[PDB]
Amino acid sequence: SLEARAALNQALEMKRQGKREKAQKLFMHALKMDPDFVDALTEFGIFSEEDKDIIQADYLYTRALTISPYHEKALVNRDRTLPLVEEIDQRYFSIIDSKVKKVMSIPKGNSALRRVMEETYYHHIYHTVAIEGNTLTLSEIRHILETRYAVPGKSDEEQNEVIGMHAAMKYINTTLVSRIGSVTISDVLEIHRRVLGYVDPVEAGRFRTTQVLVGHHIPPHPQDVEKQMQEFVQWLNSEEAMNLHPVEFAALAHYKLVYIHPFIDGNGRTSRLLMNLILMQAGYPPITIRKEQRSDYYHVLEAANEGDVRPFIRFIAKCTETTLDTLLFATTE
Ligand SMILES: Nc1ncnc2c1ncn2[C@@H]1O[C@H](COP(=O)(O)OP(=O)(O)OP(=O)(O)O)[C@@H](O)[C@H]1O
Ligand SMILES: [Mg+2]
């Protein structure tokens, strides 16, 4: 309905100007012209909740969610499944928590743990670059970082991606992990400047100024990148984010940064480092997303884009358990 659309737009204009009596008449008129107008129902629900009429607000929200008979079935079924899913999810976080406490309890000065921590360091670097076509083997990566001699018959681009990761991981471990205070845009840029610096030092440490496309994702317009990065870091240091389970917080921080995708390149590597910083600050070890999990990683990211991030959190939770099981397995004494 063209009149329903018009009635809602004026209803919202009257709401901003503080004419609530006129806004209500127009909300009612929008629903008279189109009873199944989702926008007007949801928006009139928000208006009703502001006036502290909870029953009416709930009626309008529920009406908007259940237009057709198949929506009604979806709601009654979802209301049944949600509690069971909440239980399954909560269980999996408590299972991770127990394994974290077992890893943390082990003395920092342990012969076994030190070897594992040293070996898994190169595993993360390997998987973080190999997941997007870096053909360097694990022994080659160690050679590059331990000796600082280049390997033969492998591109300087591939090897400078490894050097950049090592530089970024050192910076975090020494400077940021134990640093008490808020994480700022500058800190993210400092990580990115090291991650991409050795490959593209021109673009390393500054936002993109062009439109791009990441897989099946449409990231923000370059002119809106900076505002969304300000809103992002505001959330990072919010009380809401502090309450979240570290794995949930680390997963959300990861997804939000690759959604904004504020750099021309190195967005994945940067967002995975920020994920591990948050976990390390919370007392968890650094986790790895293996190159074998690329399709799963992309699938849960595409699901997150279309408005369900829970699969991505669950995916990061799986990657966390796998990392902990690897540390706990090395009790070979
Ligand atoms: N649908 C999606 N929505 C959001 N982010 C996505 C999506 N698909 C992929 N990504 C992320 O974007 C990354 C690719 O962007 P970019 O090339 O800037 O990262 P990179 O650091 O060069 O790659 P990588 O770290 O994976 O080796 C992927 O690795 C992934 O983390
Ligand atoms: Mg890339």
Residue at 250: amino acid letter: A
Rounded alpha-carbon distances, angstroms, from residue 17 to 8, 20, 23, 26, 292: 14, 9, 10, 14, 55
- How would you classify residue 153: left for phi > 0, otherwise alpha for psi between -120 and 50, otherwise beta? left
Round to whole Å and give the CA distance between 195 and 206: 12
Q: Is 297 annotated as a binding residue?
A: yes
Pocket of ligand 1 (CB under 6 A): 128-129, 131-132, 214-217, 258-259, 265-269, 298, 301-302, 305
Residue at 179: amino acid letter: R
Q: Which of 195, 214, 308 to mutate to test the pocket of ligand 1 (most atoms within 8 A of CB)?
A: 214
Per the DSSP assignment, residues forming a β-bridge with 275 are none
CB 127: neighbour CB atoms within 10 A? 20
| Exposed e or buried b per residue across 69-88, where buried means at least 16 C-beta atoms within 10 angstroms of its C-beta | eeeeeeeeeeeeeeeeeeee
Round to whole Å and give the CA distance between 258 and 172: 19
**Cβ 164 vs Cβ 199: under 8 Å:** yes
CA-based torsion, 82, 85, 87, 93: positive or negative = negative
Instruction: Indicate which ligand has the atom closest to the C-alpha of 265.
Output: 1
Round to whole Å and give the CA distance between 115 and 332: 11
Annotation marks residue 261 as catalytic: yes
CA of 266 to the centre of ligand 2 (A): 5
| Cα separation of the two ends of the chain | 74
Q: Is 94 annotated as a binding residue?
A: no
Q: Which of 301, 302, 319 to mutate to test the pocket of ligand 1 (most atoms within 8 A of CB)?
A: 301
**Cβ 60 vs Cβ 44: under 8 Å:** yes
Round to whole Å and give the CA distance between 234 and 3: 40
**Cβ 136 vs Cβ 176: under 8 Å:** no
Q: Which residues contact 124 (CB under 8 A, 6 or more apart)?
A: 169, 276, 286, 288
**Cβ 251 vs Cβ 275: under 8 Å:** yes
Q: Is 197 annotated as a binding residue?
A: no
Domain ranges of the chain: 79-329
Phi, psi at residue 174, to the nearest 5°? Answer: -85, -45
CA of 70 to the centre of ligand 1 (A): 36
Rounded alpha-carbon distances, angstroms, from residue 18 to 5, 29, 30, 31: 20, 18, 19, 21
| Deposited resolution, Å | 2.5
Please name the fold of domain 79-329: Fic-like fold (1.10.3290)
Looking up tokens 């899913």, which residue turns up? 85
Q: Is 181 annotated as a binding residue?
A: no
Q: Is 298 annotated as a binding residue?
A: yes
Round to whole Å and give the CA distance between 82 and 77: 9
Residues in the chain: 333
Instruction: Indicate which ligand has the atom closest to the C-alpha of 132.
Output: 1
Phi, psi at residue 151, to the nearest 5°? Answer: -90, 150
**Residue of 316, 171, 173 whose CA lies nearest to 249:** 316
**Cβ 286 vs Cβ 103: under 8 Å:** no
Atom 22 of ligand 1 has which residue's CA nearest to it?
266
Residues flanking ion ligand 2, Cβ below 5 Å: 265
Q: Which residues contact 44 (CB under 8 A, 6 or more apart)?
A: 11, 27, 30, 31, 60
By what technique were these coordinates determined? X-ray
CA of 263 to the centre of ligand 2 (A): 10
**Cβ 285 vs Cβ 106: under 8 Å:** no
Long-range Cβ pairs for the range 52-56 (8 Å, 24+): none
Residue at 322: amino acid letter: T
**Cβ 31 vs Cβ 40: under 8 Å:** yes
**Cβ 92 vs Cβ 317: under 8 Å:** yes
Phi, psi at residue 135, to the nearest 5°? Answer: -90, 0
CA of 214 to the centre of ligand 2 (A): 9
**Cβ 231 vs Cβ 244: under 8 Å:** no
Round to whole Å and give the CA distance between 202 and 198: 10
CB 292: neighbour CB atoms within 10 A? 11
- Secondary structure string (H, E, C) spanning the chain: CHHHHHHHHHHHHHHHCCCHHHHHHHHHHHHHHCCCCHHHHHHHHHHHHHCCCHHHHHHHHHHHHCCCHHHHHHHHHHHHHHHHHHHHHHHHHHHHHHHHHHHHHCCCCCHHHHHHHHHHHHHHHHHHHHCCCCCCCHHHHHHHHHCCCCCCCCCHHHHHHHHHHHHHHHHHHHHHCCCCCCCCHHHHHHHHHHHHHCCCCCCCCCCCCCCCCECCECCCCHHHHHHHHHHHHHHHCCHHHHHCCHHHHHHHHHHHHHHHCCCCCCHHHHHHHHHHHHHHHCCCCCCCCCHHHHHHHHHHHHHHHCCCCHHHHHHHHHHHHHHHHHHHHCCCC
Round to whole Å and give the CA distance between 277 and 275: 6
CB 305: neighbour CB atoms within 10 A? 16
Q: Of ligand 1's atoms, which has the minimum distance to the CA of residue 132?
A: 27
Round to whole Å and give the CA distance between 278 and 260: 18
